[PDB]
Every structure is written in structure tokens, then in C-alpha cells.
Amino acid sequence: GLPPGPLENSSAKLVNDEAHPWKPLRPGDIRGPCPGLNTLASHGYLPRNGVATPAQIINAVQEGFNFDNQAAIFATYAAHLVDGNLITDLLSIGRKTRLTGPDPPPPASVGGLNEHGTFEGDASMTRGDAFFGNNHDFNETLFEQLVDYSNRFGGGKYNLTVAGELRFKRIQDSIATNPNFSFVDFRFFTAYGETTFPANLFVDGRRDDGQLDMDAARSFFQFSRMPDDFFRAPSPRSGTGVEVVVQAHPMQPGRNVGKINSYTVDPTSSDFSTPCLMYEKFVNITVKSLYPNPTVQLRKALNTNLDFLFQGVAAGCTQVFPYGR
Numbered sequence: 200g201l202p203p204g205p206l207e208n209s210s211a212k213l214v215n216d217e218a219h220p221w222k223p224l225r226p227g228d229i230r231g232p233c234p235g236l237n238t239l240a241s242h243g244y245l246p247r248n249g250v251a252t253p254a255q256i257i258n259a260v261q262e263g264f265n266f267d268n269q270a271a272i273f274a275t276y277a278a279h280l281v282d283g284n285l286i287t288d289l290l291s292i293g294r295k296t297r298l299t300g301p302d303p304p305p306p307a308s309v310g311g312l313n314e315h316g317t318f319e320g321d322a323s324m325t326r327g328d329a330f331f332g333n334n335h336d337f338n339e340t341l342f343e344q345l346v347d348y349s350n351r352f353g354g355g356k357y358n359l360t361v362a363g364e365l366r367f368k369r370i371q372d373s374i375a376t377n378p379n380f381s382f383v384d385f386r387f388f389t390a391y392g393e394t395t396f397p398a399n400l401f402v403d404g405r406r407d408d409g410q411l412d413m414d415a416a417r418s419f420f421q422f423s424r425m426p427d428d429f430f431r432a433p434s435p436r437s438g439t440g441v442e443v444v445v446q447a448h449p450m451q452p453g454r455n456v457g458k459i460n461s462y463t464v465d466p467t468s469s470d471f472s473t474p475c476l477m478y479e480k481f482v483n484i485t486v487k488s489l490y491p492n493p494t495v496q497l498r499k500a501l502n503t504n505l506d507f508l509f510q511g512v513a514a515g516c517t518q519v520f521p522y523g524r
């Protein structure tokens with residue numbers, strides 16, 4: 200289906216309402232590394248089993264949290280291209296599942312959002328790096344560190360100042376302990392933007408003050424649960440204030456090189472000075488490597504989803520065509 204358009208009415212409103220109650224997981228229900236999508240699934244904005252179409256995801260993030268349309272489109276189609284089934288039009292928000300349908304040939308994995316190194320990556324705030332055994336479940340120790348950083352830099356609340364400090368701490372801890380730490384290209388971008396999301400989108404929209412309390416933070420991050428009487432944000436947004444996070448501790452893209460404490464800058468990586476390069480590499484390298492010589496129906500589905508992806512790219516970039524026009 201076509202990517203949904205922006206909300207017709209983007210005002211703050213109660214989104215923890217009678218039609219969207221929180222419910223606990225049933226056997227088989229999938230949750231993954233994204234507390235936003237997890238919460239939407241657990242309130243029935245998405246299918247409660249955690250398997251959805253790109254159109255369902257875009258509608259849910261807009262309706263439930265007032266995520267902006269351009270950001271919704273880019274993130275959703277990027278995730279779907281690398282982790283979803285392009286023939287069935289289904290994506291798991293967590294683990295790989297037979298529910299997304301018959302798989303394409305390798306090297307495409309259709310591994311859901313839990314797939315390491317496609318969309319998901321290292322130095323997440325409340326999830327551990329994949330090297331340490333689990334890149335998707337809520338981690339209490341990491342959450343308590345978020346609480347500590349909120350106490351130290353946010354007066355007990357999570358805000359952009361806290362984000363700036365915690366983002367850097369998680370990078371430096373991965374450098375020190377994960378010999379396979381990777382922090383380039385698509386992950387380098389998403390790792391920064393995601394740290395703004397709790398301040399921009401988990402804060403009740405009647406306040407919209409960028410100060411997230413720890414009871415609400417735990418409810419979303421651990422339980423995929425909106426606070427009682429939760430109002431969504433009062434206007435469309437995603438990553439506003441990411442400049443504050445970057446400015447706190449500016450980093451270059453790079454990786455550890457098979458050993459701890461060996462962070463080596465990658466000059467081939469995109470960075471914030473080259474946002475169109477991030478898009479071009481994502482298509483030409485990441486997507487193309489998963490689908491190097493697709494058959495007829497796959498090629499068509501790739502091109503459709505790549506056209507939708509490009510709708511989410513900030514104006515100024517040139518579309519690239521790995522499988523022709």
C-alpha cells in the first residue's frame with residue numbers, strides 16, 4: 200500500500216483511551232528493541248502480536264505518538280527493506296518469525312528488528328549490545344544508569360542534557376568492553392536521534408516540556424505501557440534537539456577493530472556533514488548486498504519500497520537506483 204500522509208489533526212489528545220488499552224503479552228506476541236513500536240503494539244495501535252505492514256507502522260507512530268510523517272516514512276521503509284518481507288509486506292518489530300511468510304533467498308535474512316547490524320545496533324540506552332548476548336530485551340542495569348544520569352544531569356528527569364551525557368557514556372562503555380563495537384553509517388545517525396525520542400515523544404503532550412519522569416520512562420521502556428491518561432505530543436516531531444546531544448560530546452563514526460579500546464575512525468562512513476551519503480550507502484551497499492540479484496517479483500517490490508524510502512529523505516538528495524528505473 201501507499202505510505203500514509205501526515206495527520207489531518209495533529210493536536211495533543213488522549214491516546215491511552217478505551218479503544219487502545221494496554222494488554223499483557225500472549226504466547227507468540229513479539230516485542231523488540233524499540234520502546235515506541237512495542238508500546239503501540241501493546242496498546243493495539245499495531246497488531247498486538249508485533250507483526251505489521253509498513254502502512255500500519257506509519258499510521259501507528261503518527262496516531263499514537265505524533266511522530267512526524269517524513270521521519271516515519273524513512274525509518275519504516277528502511278527497517279522494512281533490511282528486516283521485513285518485501286513480498287508479503289510484513290515486518291516483525293522483534294525476533295525473526297515465520298509469521299512474515301516465505302523467506303527470500305539469502306543473503307537476505309528477514310530477521311525482524313532484532314537483526315543486529317541492519318537497523319538495530321550498538322550503544323543503545325536500555326538494551327545491551329548484541330555481542331553481550333541480547334540486543335532487544337529491556338535491561339534493568341542499563342535503565343538504572345539512565346535513572347542515575349537523569350538524577351545527575353536532569354534534576355531527576357530525562358531531558359536533552361541527560362541524553363547528551365548518556366549517549367556518550369554508552370559509546371565509551373561499548374568501546375571499553377565490546378571488541379566488535381560498530382558505530383558507523385546508519386547506526387551513527389539513529390543512535391543520536393533515538394536519544395531525543397523519550398524527551399520529545401514520551402512526555403505527556405499537555406506539558407511537552409522535554410522533561411520525562413522516571414515512572415513514565417520505566418512504563419514505556421520496560422512495560423511498553425503508556426501512563427494512565429497519557430496525551431500524545433501536541434504537534435508532529437521526531438528528533439528535534441539532536442544538535443544538543445551531539446554538541447555535548449561530538450564523535451566521529453568508527454568501530455573497534457576486534458579488540459577493546461581500539462576505536463578506529465572510518466573515513467568511508469557518512470557523518471552529520473554528509474546526510475545524503477548515509478542514504479546512498481544504505482541503498483547501494485546495505486539493501487543491495489541483501490538482494491544482489493533479485494528475481495522478478497522481488498525486484499519490483501524492492502523498487503516500490505525504495506521509492507517510498509526516498510519520500511522520507513530530506514530534500515536536497517538525489518535518488519539512487521540499484522535495480523534501474
Ligand code: HEM
Binds near residue numbers: 260264275326389
Ligand atoms: C517509525 C518507525 C520506527 C521504527 C522502524 C523504529 C525502529 C527502532 C529500532 C530498530 C530501534 C533499535 C535501535 C537500537 O537501539 O539498537 C529503535 C530504538 C528506539 N526507538 Fe524506535 N522505531 C520507530 C519509531 C519510534 C517512535 C515513534 C518512538 C517513540 C515514540 C521510538 C523510540 C525509540 C527509542 C527511545 C529507542 C531507543 C531504545 C534504547 O536505546 O534503549 N521509536 N527503534
Ligand SMILES: *[C@@H]1O[C@H](CO)[C@@H](O)[C@H](O)[C@H]1NC(C)=O
Binds near residue numbers: 208210211212
Ligand atoms: C482536533 O482534535 C482535537 C483533540 O482531539 C479537537 O479538540 C479539535 O477540535 C480538532 N480539530 C478539528 C479541526 O476538528
Ligand SMILES: *[C@@H]1O[C@H](CO)[C@@H](O)[C@H](O)[C@H]1NC(C)=O
Binds near residue numbers: 381
Ligand atoms: C560484529 O560486527 C559486524 C559488523 O562490523 C557484524 O556483521 C556482526 O553481526 C557483529 N556481531 C555482534 C555479535 O556484534
Ligand SMILES: *[C@@H]1O[C@H](CO)[C@@H](O)[C@H](O)[C@H]1NC(C)=O
Binds near residue numbers: 327338339340341
Ligand atoms: C544488562 O546490562 C548489564 C550491564 O551492561 C550486563 O552486565 C548484563 O549482563 C545485562 N543483562 C542482564 C540480564 O542483566
Ligand SMILES: *[C@@H]1O[C@H](CO)[C@@H](O)[C@H](O)[C@H]1NC(C)=O
Binds near residue numbers: 360361
Ligand atoms: C535538564 O534538566 C536540568 C535540571 O533541571 C537543567 O539544568 C537542564 O537545563 C535541562 N536541559 C534541558 C535541555 O531541558
Ligand SMILES: *[C@@H]1O[C@H](CO)[C@@H](O)[C@H](O)[C@H]1NC(C)=O
Binds near residue numbers: 479480
Ligand atoms: C550509488 O549508486 C549510484 C548508481 O546507481 C551512483 O550514482 C552513486 O554515486 C552511488 N553512491 C554511492 C555512495 O556509492
Ligand SMILES: c1ccc2ccccc2c1
Binds near residue numbers: 270438
Ligand atoms: C530509530 C528509529 C526511528 C527513527 C526515525 C527517524 C530518525 C531516526 C530513527 C532512529
Ligand SMILES: [Cl-]
Binds near residue numbers: 206
Ligand atoms: Cl508530519
Ligand SMILES: [Mg+2]
Binds near residue numbers: 328
Ligand atoms: Mg541496539
